[PDB]
Amino acid sequence: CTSIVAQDSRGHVYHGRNLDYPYGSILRKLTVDVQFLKNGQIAFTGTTFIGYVGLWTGQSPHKFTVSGDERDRGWWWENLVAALFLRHSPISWLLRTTLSEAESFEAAVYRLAKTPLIADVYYIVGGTNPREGVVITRNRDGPADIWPLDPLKGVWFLVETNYDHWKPAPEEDDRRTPAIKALNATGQAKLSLETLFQVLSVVPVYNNYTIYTTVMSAASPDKYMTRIRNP
């Protein structure tokens, strides 16, 4: 999977993501966008598969946008002890709980970072104001690292696949470089939802296992766009 939060020259923040997973021929037919209503009014939007109640891609309108990528660390028995004996939270559920109860980008980044989990994950959050963008590397008991946007220092985009950003992506699976490569060339002046979609449409960022691509901006909720990918 590949999550990208980036800022453009005019101060806007965009969030896009890819979701790769086997059994694609099935999940593509079951993929749906869902609008969760409170009192008849939309409270947040998400992309999920029929039968899955958690969210791996969501948007709280005019507050923030969050997505999740897999982080495989620890031992198999950690997830067991954490889930049953310690009663930690599932990843996809916390992501959904936050989209519904967090009152601000700051509040969401707090919940997604400090709430205990059953297993590790990468949480990517975007905001409605400039420089609001982070990549929360999660340990089970807390945050292992927070990676903030810094446009004035030249970092106007964060690219997260499934590996810690302070280390190089493995040779076997290095979808970070072609994603950075396409962003380095797109330019902070040309960045938009249309362009950010074409970034994620690059190979091998867009590979055989990609199921859907979502591009979203918390301050432009009506532009929430998901597209099923048939490679």
Binding site: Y23, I26, K29, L30, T31, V32, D33, V34, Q35, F36, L37, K38, N39, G40, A43, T47, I50, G51, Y52, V53, G54, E70, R71, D72, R73, G74, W75, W76, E78, N79, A83, L84, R87, S89, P90, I91, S92, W93, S100, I118, A119, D120, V121, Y212, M225, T226, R227, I228
Partner: protein, 95 residues
Amino acid sequence: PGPPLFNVSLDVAPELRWLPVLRHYDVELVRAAVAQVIGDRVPKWVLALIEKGALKLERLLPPPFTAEIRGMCDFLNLSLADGLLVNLAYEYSAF
């Protein structure tokens, strides 16, 4: 166009809120689909261990997490163990 768009009112009890969506889906496609994600990656005794202890396991998970799954599995006629196995699929193999 993109994928279908549905509404899920959180003002409806957890077990009922997902059901208006399932009307649009073949109860067989969903159920048969699960067996392919399940049968090929988990032995039965695990599934039996879960099934036997599934009703005590769901006591631990968040109430609204399981309640929504329970309602879908009754409507679709799925085993609750199969339900909890796909929703905790990430947590089952992420280490």
